[PDB]
């Protein structure tokens, strides 16, 4: 079953950094969304 | 999350330009035939011209 090593590590070495509990959403995002309710 | 809240451009837009309308509904003058005499008719003689027109 599960090998736990995908090549999804690329990202975490310096592009990313571990344990920063980092927002899934650009805030301007969030603000395009909300004015585009309206 | 109501449809009221993406038509208060519109309706706004509506009112306005209905408003202009009742307005210039009453306020225009409905005569035709604008007609002016010149300046040497003898009022006396230019009424009769009114009255013939």
Do not use: H
């Not at chain 2, 210039?24 to 409905?30: I, K, L, V």
Request: proline share 7%; charged share 20%; no cysteine.
């Amino acid at each position: 079953p599960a090998p736990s090593a995908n090549p999804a590590k690329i990202f975490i070495r310096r592009f990313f950094s571990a344990g920063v509990a980092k927002n899934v959403v650009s805030y301007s995002n969030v603000m395009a969304a909300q004015r585009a309710m309206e | 999350n109501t449809p009221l809240q993406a038509i208060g451009v519109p309706v706004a837009l509506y009112d306005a330009l209905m408003a202009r309308a009742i307005d210039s509904a009453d306020g225009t003058p409905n005569s035709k035939w604008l007609v002016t005499a010149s300046r040497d008719l003898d009022d006396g003689q230019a009424k009769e011209v009114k009255e013939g027109i």
